[PDB]
Design a protein around this ligand. Sequence first.
Ligand SMILES: Cc1cc(S(=O)(=O)N[C@H](C)C(=O)NO)ccc1F
Ligand SMILES: [Zn+2]
Length: 503
Amino acid sequence: SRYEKWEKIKQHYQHWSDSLSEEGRGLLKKLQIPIEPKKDDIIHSLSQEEKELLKRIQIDSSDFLSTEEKEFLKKLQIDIRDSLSEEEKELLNPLSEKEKEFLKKLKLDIQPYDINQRLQDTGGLIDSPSINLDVRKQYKRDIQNIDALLHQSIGSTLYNKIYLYENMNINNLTATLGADLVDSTDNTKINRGIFNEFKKNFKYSISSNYMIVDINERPALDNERLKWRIQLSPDTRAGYLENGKLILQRNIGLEIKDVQIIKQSEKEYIRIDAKVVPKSKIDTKIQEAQLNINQEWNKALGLPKYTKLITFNVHNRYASNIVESAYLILNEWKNNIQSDLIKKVTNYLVDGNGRFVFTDITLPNIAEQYTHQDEIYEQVHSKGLYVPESRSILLHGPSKGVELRNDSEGFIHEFGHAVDDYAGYLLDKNQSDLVTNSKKFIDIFKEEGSNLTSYGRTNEAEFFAEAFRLMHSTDHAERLKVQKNAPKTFQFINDQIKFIINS
Ligand SMILES: Cc1cc(S(=O)(=O)N[C@H](C)C(=O)NO)ccc1F
Ligand SMILES: [Zn+2]
């Protein structure tokens, strides 16, 4: 019975609920309902020129903000444009230098106080210098206090009598597969192929924030196609939340027991059955996996066995896929790029203590970035990233890059940046730079810069990287388009590759 179960669990935590302080309650409420930034105050704090700038700016054109930072700026833009005319509003590409630098500093002032979000973004590494220091300390105090509140386990009586539930948006786990998981012809069906890709490498899950689950399964909203059914362990700590819900302790492990396609009210959903395990159990599987993929690829690249090249920075709910997808990504990388170029460049990265960082936490919270990027407004979150100061490639699992078909296409783009780096280094080892800053390629970019992908138009660095990406696509047509639409760039990259190999 739904209601008896609800009552039985509520009574279990009843003394706990009654014992909560006024501070404890407010803290628990703050967690469920994050404190949003005050739009009025933000807009008021802008200058007249900055308002006009924010008013006309194409927000989606950015490539360093999060989906949530973009969503807020969109709302901020609306309030700005309100006072305008009806005809003018109807009227209202990469960003200009002026625009980009403005958004970069503006993102510092649009951060909501969201404890769960901070935990997921950092994967628990809450000391990461990706937010204001004072806010960071407020988060630490709140999280520690919440950990203290959640001291009562579910019990050895209830843990195997109850299932708890969670509806989830597919884009939470993976934006890439989420775009094509629902059948395009029939919205009520799941694409059997994509469902297989999703199901195959999903064996375990990690929660670095506090899961808020339903005691009783509620019908999914239209964006929710994932129906988690969770069984807790006896010593899993939790707390009762009003309207039949439970707040779970952070840092729990979840073994994926079964993933099925089910029908609820004449529509297909994905059932994910999970069992709570000690997180350390999962972390061991991850660490063992990292030890393995490094051994396989050190040999394959002729690197010493003790070389730490590939890093798994995994802390979130689609954990196992981040690990398993890494194999598939590097396989494609090996297939579509000549071995000598790969070895030469990888050795350069290893000589700089560089890493291949595969992660499900946001890239500003990766040490390989933030150690060389003190300024938050310069910190970038994106699908992928190359950091020359650390000689590191960063690849963010859950997200989706612009006009990419897969993660492997993203990684090759980033390897392109490393090629851009090494080649510029070989030209002048004393004063190392990027070949894309050479007068030659700058002229090539001034001419052919718009002939490839839209994103390639950003700058000479990204252009080189996009060209390099398409030159090594599995699609032969794409490789030819570069040769035909940007022949100078085509030869320029080929020259660098030869020069690198012959070095
Ligand atoms: C087209 C493309 C875009 C991106 S991105 O994440 O959206 N852009 C970021 C800033 C990037 O280029 N990092 O190297 C990453 C890889 C790609 F191939
Ligand atoms: Zn790039």
